[PDB]
């Protein structure tokens, strides 16, 4: 299994080089809509944009733009929407997208404030008595309950379409202990969070794709998604060896640029995968 390749790269200190070549090989597609002057304030990072071919479009004739990409993994048959942490002006959009795409879960792998700066808006209500209503998108959001734990918190939110008056339970999985641009050192904590996300059914085919985000929606998001798909493919085939993580990542990269922000996050992905393989291989 890839545990050997890991053993090698590690003992050869080739992680940075391995990673750079992935960059060298990554797809390049236009992000023209993202770059339109009108969408300037809809993007958190000038350098992180959704390709036009895979971007999620809002169902509104006004401005259908949201910095979000539909990562569609055909082989594994799993889809994810990776997106930047919503901005003060784009939280309505974010929830409109969650609604229109029929998402059931939202995986947040960052904190509103990191390294002294605001890396994401507070797009969800922290107290059940104080719900949020997104006037622009005409949606109401309410916290029904939350289960806070050591390094993560799961929240149960109710999103209501004030138009159709319809209601939906949205599960919010928030990893609170993962360093920006970092690795959550210990595949254990990551995998435990991953499996909690899985067990919720949020990742199931019967639901729209799960919305995964961090600040830019490429580093830690890439990691979550990469480790999950790799484990999914090993599962389908019940054959850990048939999985090439670099090929998997390069395929995710055709849907959104920059997934896996540092060589360590890549190294971490192997770790989480090789270790998650245990369980996936019958050692539940």
Swiss-Prot record:
Residue numbers of the full-length protein present here: 2 to 285 of 435
Superkingdom of this protein's organism: Eukaryota
Localization of this protein: Endoplasmic reticulum membrane
Residues annotated as catalytic: 214
EC numbers on record: 3.1.3.48
Protein name: Tyrosine-protein phosphatase non-receptor type 1
Gene Ontology terms, MF aspect: cadherin binding; enzyme binding; ephrin receptor binding; insulin receptor binding; non-membrane spanning protein tyrosine phosphatase activity; protein kinase binding; protein phosphatase 2A binding; protein tyrosine phosphatase activity
Residue(s) carrying Phosphotyrosine: 19, 65
Residues annotated to bind substrate: 180, 214-220, 261
GO cellular component, one term: glutamatergic synapse
PTM annotation: Oxidized on Cys-214; the Cys-SOH formed in response to redox signaling reacts with the alpha-amido of the following residue to form a sulfenamide cross-link, triggering a conformational change that inhibits substrate binding and activity. The active site can be restored by reduction. Ser-49 is the major site of phosphorylation as compared to Ser-241 and Ser-242. Activated by phosphorylation at Ser-49.
Modified residue annotations for Cysteine sulfenic acid (-SOH): 214
Effect of residue 214 to S: Catalytically inactive mutant; abolishes sulfhydration
Keywords: Acetylation, Endoplasmic reticulum, Hydrolase, Membrane, Oxidation, Phosphoprotein, Protein phosphatase, S-nitrosylation
Main location: endoplasmic reticulum
Modified residues (S-nitrosocysteine): 214
Swiss-Prot/TrEMBL GO biological process terms: actin cytoskeleton organization; cellular response to angiotensin; cellular response to fibroblast growth factor stimulus; cellular response to hypoxia; cellular response to nerve growth factor stimulus; cellular response to nitric oxide; cellular response to platelet-derived growth factor stimulus; cellular response to unfolded protein
Record family assignment: Belongs to the protein-tyrosine phosphatase family. Non-receptor class 1 subfamily.
Domain Tyrosine-protein phosphatase span(s) in chain numbering: 2-276
UniProt function note: Tyrosine-protein phosphatase which acts as a regulator of endoplasmic reticulum unfolded protein response. Mediates dephosphorylation of EIF2AK3/PERK; inactivating the protein kinase activity of EIF2AK3/PERK. May play an important role in CKII- and p60c-src-induced signal transduction cascades. May regulate the EFNA5-EPHA3 signaling pathway which modulates cell reorganization and cell-cell repulsion. May also regulate the hepatocyte growth factor receptor signaling pathway through dephosphorylation of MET.
Residues bearing the modification Cysteine persulfide: 214
Membrane topology of this protein: Peripheral membrane protein
Residues modified to Cysteine sulfinic acid (-SO2H): 214
Residue numbers bearing the Phosphoserine modification: 49, 241-242
Tissues showing expression: Expressed in keratinocytes (at protein level).
Reactions this protein catalyses: O-phospho-L-tyrosyl-[protein] + H2O = L-tyrosyl-[protein] + phosphate
Subunit details: Interacts with EPHA3 (phosphorylated); dephosphorylates EPHA3 and may regulate its trafficking and function. Interacts with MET. Interacts with NCK1.
